[PDB]
From a paper:
[name] belongs to the widespread, evolutionarily ancient formate-nitrite transporter (FNT) family of pentameric anion channels and translocates formic acid bidirectionally. Central to the FNT family’s function are conserved histidine and threonine residues (H209 and T91 in [name] [name]), both of which are essential for pH-dependent formate:H+ symport into fermenting [name] cells.
A [name]-[name] variant that exhibits an efflux-only channel-like function in vivo reveals a density consistent with formate located directly at N209, abolishing the channel’s amphiphilicity. Immunological analysis of plasmid-encoded [name]-[name] revealed that it is as stable as the native [name] protein15 and PflB is also stably produced in strain DH4200 (synthesizing [name]-[name]). This indicates that this location is important for translocation, promoting the possibility that the captured density corresponds to the substrate.
Numbering used by the authors:
A (entry chain A), B (entry chain A), C (entry chain A), D (entry chain A), E (entry chain A): 6 to 280
The structure:
């Protein structure tokens, strides 16, 4: 009563949440994953808006403010009960406890991944129809294009490790929020961990599902006035391809996400406490 | 007790609030809508004051600070119980639940819209009688004029999508505040979502009801000293017309507001939880 | 229990506080008004200290930081139970409810006004005896002089409307703090509304009771070294006169304060809820 | 329960705390005063570290950040139960109530003053042995020397009034923290009042007990490399003398501290409420 | 209930936590120490990311932001129940109380130290495999190298005193967090004390266990493109050697850590309260 949960109780509520999320109806899970993807896309839009025009600003300060803005998406995911893949990886605790089977875990992960992708694509369509890429004389679109272009230029091991580091922070934020008992203890304990992985540049698969397709759409369908304003051409971002997106980024970053989240946070604390 | 509300309880308190707001007396609803319009105009005044003179400042940082300042209006609307149209669209949850009829919804929406417009006009009159447009050697009035001029230059589909995105954030902030149990959990969970839509540039109909008429009034009745100080002439803002305001902005942004708020937040969560 | 007060309960605690404040002993009211004036003078000293040297800083950011600093005075007034005139105007709710008479209201308002003036003068004497006007090579005194000089150059209608807007924000902050149940919900819900009216430039009579006499004292009794450092002369601020202070500022700003506070916040919510 | 304390209860808990602190064992009081002096020295070290290199930064912003950093010391003093002289002056409430005698008050004040001085000297020794004065190519030591040099150049009446203003803010912060019921309401209500007196330049005797001896030690025992880096010589700070420290600063600032704290905060509220 | 713990209760919960941590199973202690080292490495990564490119920024502001970012690691250690050596030194309270023996204390300290080192090395390997040292055209790696190089250039007495000061702040933050009763009172009371020791430059042994080996790895295995971008050569950091790391830094900083933490915080408060 009125007290923060101790780590053992944190692990037991994590186990219970894993069982609850794994036993939910597939259609409800799909809808919640769509909302989670929409929230993550909202967070990346805030990040891009905040970090626009900060070239003269110091690198660390601008990235820190961008991460503080980006934490809104995962705060929304936690508060609104949406199913985010980075958070659904933590059902490995319930899997190890034996309360859920491997088939339930596989179905939940697939459903949440697909729903997150659908939500990210829907928000990409909305963002493009809004005309946001011409903000600040095209600097918003240029920021989107540069952010997307940088993510497609990583090695397999580098992408895997970046995904491990990103899902480490996301699952640590979720685990810490498990201790909170109010809307504020479950939101303010989650700004710094997310801001770390956003400012550092760690790669999140769900966030990339919004980022890279947005960059591809802007590279393809931008008006010539946008290119004239930004002083660049589409051939400067030729590497922004769907196949390159899925191959150079999606698979390695996703594999790193599983390895980080449900091996370095879920399983380790299950071993420490719930074994 | 002492715990944040779970999403199912959040949806049920949203339904109950919708029924309560739809069954209120029309005169009380009109007065509360007037207060809500006054609060929204207060928020836009804070935004304009904060963002004045930030041309040299980075775009994202200045817009983020402006949004943080702007969140005060919706915080006031939630705390003081005022009826804001962006929030009254969420009575579609109670409509879908069957607790209220279509006539009640239509009457509530019309009354709240009219009251918000009346409150915005009253605060426009107060702001003009205050002489605030000559602050910082006319940079306050110039900021108001530029903000109003930019909003009148959007396509129908772009305005509709911008309104969808704005009401998405507003209704998401309201839905998240439904989880809080104190004045602080119902205020700090609402700064970031509002700051997102303010910094990004998403269009809110109620906020525009204060913004654009203020710009028209300043364009019409400004002293020649103000124009000399700002180095511009009224013909530079010829497009700032009442008919252009209602046609290019009000109808599309309002339609986008309904489509965002009571289709992408209210109905989706009613389907997920209250069906 | 553990929950924020609903607007009806907020209005009833406002009514009860009005009755309690109107029925207090006159000497206790005088002492509390003196403490309130001291707190308001403390807030203006923080504002001046924070905004010193921010000429190169953007206008909005500097004024926002100054308002955040200024909110300390009204936070102190609320927490410590001091009687501030901007807050005592809200006893019009209890007057309309019939719990107090017109004579009690008049006596309370006069006593609180006189006590606030006495406290502001005492803090002016303390500030002058401290030697603070020579801070930053006289930039503190120059900031005080410019702030005082700008306030004496407003029309009657402009001053009345500025006072209306200022007391609107002050009474709205008090009304919102009525909802809070802890020291933090009653302090953080009060920073933004005060910061708005401070950054915008709205005129508060009690704050001006410290500001303008301080400027007059500095204009009169400053050392020639201060004038040499600031590169100005007393004849540059000839308009800073006590008669000009009371006539151009005190009466119109005070009348606007009553019209804002106990007509646009107190009476409107009494009509909505307590009628 | 769950509610902030009303001013009458705040005064009664202040009286009870005064009796408790006055009736404590002298050795425990001495140890707690040593810890309080260490905490105050920690706060001044944070202030110096934060304000180092901020010459190009605006005066008010840099001093505000320095005060926010400095509030940590008094937050530590309140949370950890240390006996700080600025806080022990408030036992005048219990003295006026008759619960403690004059001898107890005198012994408590002397013991706390001596313990604070001993703790400040111990932290001065630790800071010198750490080698911190060579941080940022000697700018840390130069900041310490300038801060110490400015404090030794005040008139008796100016020093007395500055001490009155400083202890006013410190005792007001303590009195406001008496209302809080958790670690957060007793810490966040204390940042702004302390930041005011730090940013403004009001003189605290305990803080000066760390500041000035540190400056004397740096002036005496600095390496010639430090002087070469800072581009100055010890003769530029000849006035930094122990006798000048105790005569020009310690006695007047301390007398102002008593007059502020236990006449303008303690006795006034005892008269208002506890008489 | 709902109230912050008084200092006597703070000391008794510190004693109980010491007994609990000293009586835990060695393998669980090792795993928790590994997680604590990972969290500390995460905090140093945030610090490096935040402070990258802030050469033009004022020294104090940049170091303050870096410390605010760095506080995340110790917040994670407290919330997640990890065993950090700087925190395990406080079991000297339980040792003095007689509840645990000297052998238990020695075994706990050795196990926690070894686990922290293993976790720091694992995160060093992950950081190197991520490729983070090429961020901002090698400015991230240059910041890491400079931070590591500066720490290897301290005298024995200076390193001992810096460790004393660092563990003072860490143990004071832990002791203050013992008073909090929620996730927020146990996190926000811990940002300022950690930020102090990070901004000032006080040396923490566990943090150095991540910092210096990372610098050695970057100095050894960096690509020539990184050196070309940063405009430097490995011979500029020849002193970055493992033997120099353990001799010039590890032993003196660790000894200072024990002397600070479990003599100046644990034993002093045991003497004041628990004797």
């Amino acid at each position: 009563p009125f007290d923060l949960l101790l780590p053992a109780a944190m692990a037991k509520v994590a186990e219970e949440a894993g069982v609850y999320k794994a036993t939910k109806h597939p259609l409800k899970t799909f809808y919640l994953a769509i909302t989670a993807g929409v929230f993550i896309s909202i967070a990346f839009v805030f990040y891009i808006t905040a970090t626009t025009g900060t070239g003269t600003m110091p690198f660390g300060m601008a990235k820190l403010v961008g991460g503080i803005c980006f934490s809104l998406g995962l705060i929304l995911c936690v508060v609104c009960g949406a199913d985010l893949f980075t958070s659904t990886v933590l059902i490995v605790v319930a899997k190890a406890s034996g309360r859920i089977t491997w088939g339930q875990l596989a179905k939940n992960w697939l459903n949440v991944y697909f729903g997150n992708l659908v939500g990210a694509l829907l928000f990409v369509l909305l963002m493009w129809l809004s005309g946001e890429y011409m903000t600040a004389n095209g600097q918003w679109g240029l920021n989107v294009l540069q952010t997307a272009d940088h993510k497609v230029h990583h090695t397999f091991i580098e992408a895997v490790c970046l995904g491990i580091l990103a899902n480490l922070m996301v699952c640590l934020a979720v685990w810490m929020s498990y201790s909170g008992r109010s809307l504020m203890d479950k939101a303010f304990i989650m700004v710094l961990p997310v801001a770390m992985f956003v400012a550092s540049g760690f790669e999140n698969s769900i966030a990339n599902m919004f980022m890279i397709p947005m960059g591809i759409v802007i590279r393809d369908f931008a008006s010539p006035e946008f290119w004239t304003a930004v002083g660049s051409a589409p051939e400067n971002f030729s590497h922004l391809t769907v196949m390159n997106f899925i191959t150079d980024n999606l698979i390695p970053v996703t594999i790193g996400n599983i390895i980080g989240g449900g091996l370095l946070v879920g399983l380790t604390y299950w071993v420490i406490y719930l074994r």
